[PDB]
Amino acid sequence: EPLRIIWGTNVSIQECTTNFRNFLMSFKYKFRKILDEREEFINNTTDEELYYIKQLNEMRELGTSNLNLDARNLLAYKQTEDLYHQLLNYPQEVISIMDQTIKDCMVSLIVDNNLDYDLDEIETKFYKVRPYNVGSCKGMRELNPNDIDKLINLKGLVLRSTPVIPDMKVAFFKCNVCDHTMAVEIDRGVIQEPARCERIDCNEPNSMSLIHNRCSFADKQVIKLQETPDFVPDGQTPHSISLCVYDELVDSCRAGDRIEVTGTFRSIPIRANSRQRVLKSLYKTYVDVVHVKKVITDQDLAKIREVAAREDLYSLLARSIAPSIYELEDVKKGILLQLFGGTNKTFTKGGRYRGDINILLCGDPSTSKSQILQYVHKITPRGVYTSGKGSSAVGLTAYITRDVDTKQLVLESGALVLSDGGVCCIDEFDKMSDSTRSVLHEVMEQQTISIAKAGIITTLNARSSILASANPIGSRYNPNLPVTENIDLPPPLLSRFDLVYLVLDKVDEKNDRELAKHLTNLYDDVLPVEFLTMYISYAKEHIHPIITEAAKTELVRAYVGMRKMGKRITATTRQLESMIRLAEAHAKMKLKNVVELEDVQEAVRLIRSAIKDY
């Protein structure tokens, strides 16, 4: 009988197919547990139930096709140890056999179970297998020629990924004489164009045309991978390897992401020049990836509501924001209110009123100010870290650049644009370019960035809050001089921040002693950072407070009283919009849809304390 054998070996394809089918049909995780010397963790329900049968059933239910296989499970089964070794040694043929067997079992399940599921849909699908955990991960520097055409594991950091490349699968040809069409498959990238028309009646030789847009294509993408920092032996430039991903694996990993990839180590000849079949002696190595790994519910809503119902929610959130910062309750409260933010109003006849809150953190350099910004970044769902006059940062304004990679013109958005809807923390506000200051003024005034350079006229949304930090001109902030002189910023730009905080490191025996105790000990419940971020996201997404009559009366009375204090002008209309925003944010914090007198009272107090510093 014809007997099919993998080229260069003595392994029968029929044996591999039957072994894999038996393994898939009958396998339980208890075998893996006993293999891993974890037999005493075996339960009675999950470990005694078929695993891959359930996986196939769930795949059919969800309509997916790809199957994730743990190579160790093959060792966990007596029959498939040889199959595991063959997969490690001859991956291409074994993988093709596994795909066909997976399709066969998928159809056989429906055939045997006489289910009502449509069979034609199944027959027209393509099935694949994605093995992983095939042994210890090697290094990019340990790949010798002996590893060619063998399955390897490699950990690294993604550096770049080319756009989707169309890869040809089936070629479509048309007859120029009889309008007859035929599809010819492609093998090793070689199109098998007919010599002549296949029609008996029309035997016209050499009259076949390839219709490019009517052919079948596939997705391909090339990714550059760099070895992990620990793999560098001395500290030289880390090496890199090229990866290829097809179909579903495309767009499965972005730049800067640490991933683990399983694939086949392959070598391909490189043509000397474009005119000729001549090849270079040296071969190029790459990896044909087959598997990639990266290294709100009802219960969540119930937990959020329970937390909101707590009486001391404000203090709890303030403490959770900055556990490591000592005795800055007011600053933490202001930061919390900024994080929650006010209500964005989209007015017909009026225009746009911003609901963001801006806070300036100025004072002595000894006190902790950058750590607060880092915490705010860690908490805010959206935001970017930047320092004025900083080359490392991407930038505060949109700019037109050249894509070195592609030699293409690309419009890149700045830090403020990327922070749309979030909090943008600027570490060093004091030192900043004039241009950057003008951009900041425009963003805080119009909330949009406009660029009219390089033949492009566009406006980018920048609806983001700002939390900047500043330092005095000298080694300390002089109380005698006014804040404007000390901070060294234009009065206009300094008058746009809703809350201005002057954290000063006055020399006090008690305060110094307590700070020393806190710092040395570093060598009231607190919420996890993840839960706080989720709470902030939910509050900002769902709750929208509205002002009531009592709130209106309280706001009017408070503004009138503040104005009557001072001729010197104690407060301006900006001090009213700031109070409105702060009250709305506080109402947001309590998950309330109505602003009440308590929120207005809290707002007047936070605004007044900053004014008193001013």
Binding site: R4, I5, E123, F126, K169, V170, R188, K220
Partner: protein
């Protein structure tokens, strides 16, 4: 929309059958297969389907071959003879896509003409042409024959669809003047080796035989005068001619083949029906003698050739071909004729999943015939091992052994 949905479903089934030949992974995956022959020699093939299947492996082995045997086709430009494009050379299935209103108008015009003056026009044309036969050029012969055939067939179809409008409007075809004119035209075209006029006369004669069959179906007593016509038209020379047509058909275009097939079918139909109904005198007609006349290697060859092009034919052509095959294999018991390899290869192609749609009556005919043919072939092979060799080659013509080969006794 309904027809579009049906066609889309048909294309979906075709694509589904095509899918089994495509690899899930990309082309450059690089799977290599080694296949072992009955002797210990290994052949190499590439592709996932090769590893997972054997029939695909052999198909790829075949397909990969570079050498092609030359095929020479005898093509005649219609413009050379001055004729226009017509049913003779138009590809089978070429459909004129009318609009609903235009189709209604054309049908009404044709119906009115057939009910008003087709009889008189045919009579006048036949008189004028039989008076001036020799001066005919090829164009006039083809024109007259095609017009007659088309209108007779259209009236037959409309009579089938509608019980009102009936054969009496085209009854002038039956009259002997037109019949003898057509017979003389066809016979002369045959004799002089003018194949286009031959084709036109073939079509006209097929329509005339279908018409006469319908008239006999109408009324027997009124069809005694048409039994006269049947006796006249089945003259021994005519029998011979009609039999010869198929034997030569294999040489010429597809359309020639199809017309041959259809005329053969009609001839056998009328012969059998009129032998069963009553006795026939031209010289008495021996239906078995005619049948036997029809049983030779060229006929079969012709049939095979025609059936090879089954992806363009309808179900009616396949039905007629396999009716003929049934006559051959069962009624005539001339099975040695069909114990060939062209038929086996073609039948594998027909019954393969990629060949013919499963939901089709043509596949039902093919499957039944294949079952019977395989059973009889297995019995013969069990009897005579020599037939394994025999299959490969044309029949022997040896007095000694010929009988043995043909009939096994």
């Amino acid at each position: 929309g309904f027809e579009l949905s049906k066609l889309l479903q048909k294309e979906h089934q075709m694509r589904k059958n095509v899918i089994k030949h495509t690899s899930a992974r990309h082309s450059r995956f690089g799977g290599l297969l080694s296949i072992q022959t009955p002797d210990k020699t290994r052949l190499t093939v590439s592709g996932s389907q090769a590893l997972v299947d054997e029939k695909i492996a052999l198909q790829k082995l075949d397909d990969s071959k570079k050498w092609n045997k030359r095929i020479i086709k005898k093509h005649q430009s219609v413009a050379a003879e001055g004729l226009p494009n017509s049913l003779l050379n138009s590809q089978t299935g070429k459909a004129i896509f009318f609009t609903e209103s235009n189709g209604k108008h054309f049908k009404e015009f044709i119906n009115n003409f057939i009910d008003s003056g087709f009889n008189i026009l045919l009579h006048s044309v036949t008189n004028y042409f039989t008076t001036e036969q020799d001066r005919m050029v090829t164009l006039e012969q083809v024109e007259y024959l095609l017009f007659f055939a088309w209108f007779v067939k259209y009236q037959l179809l409309r009579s089938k669809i509608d019980n009102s409008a009936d054969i009496k409007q085209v009854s002038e075809a039956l009259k002997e003047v037109t019949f003898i004119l057509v017979s003389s035209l066809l016979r002369s075209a045959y004799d002089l080796k003018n194949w286009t006029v031959t084709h036109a006369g073939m079509i006209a004669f097929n329509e005339l035989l279908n018409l006469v069959s319908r008239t006999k179906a109408a009324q027997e007593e009124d069809s005694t005068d048409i039994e006269f016509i049947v006796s006249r038209l089945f003259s021994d020379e005519r029998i011979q001619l009609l039999s010869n047509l198929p034997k030569i058909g294999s040489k010429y275009s597809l359309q020639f083949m199809k017309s041959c097939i259809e005329l053969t079918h009609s001839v056998l139909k009328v012969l059998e029906q009129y032998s069963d109904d009553k006795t026939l005198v031209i010289i008495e007609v021996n239906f078995q003698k005619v049948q036997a006349n029809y049983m030779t290697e060229p006929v079969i060859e012709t049939y095979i050739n025609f059936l090879e092009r089954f992806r363009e034919l309808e179900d009616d052509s396949i039905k007629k071909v396999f009716s003929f095959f049934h006559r051959v294999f069962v009624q005539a018991k001339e099975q040695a004729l069909l114990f060939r390899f062209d038929l086996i290869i073609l039948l594998r192609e027909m019954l393969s999943p990629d060949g013919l749609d499963r939901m089709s009556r043509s596949r039902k005919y093919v499957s039944q015939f294949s079952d019977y043919f395989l059973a009889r072939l297995k019995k013969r092979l069990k009897k005579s091992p020599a037939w394994f060799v025999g299959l490969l080659f044309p029949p022997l013509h040896n007095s000694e052994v010929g009988f043995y080969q043909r009939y096994g006794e």
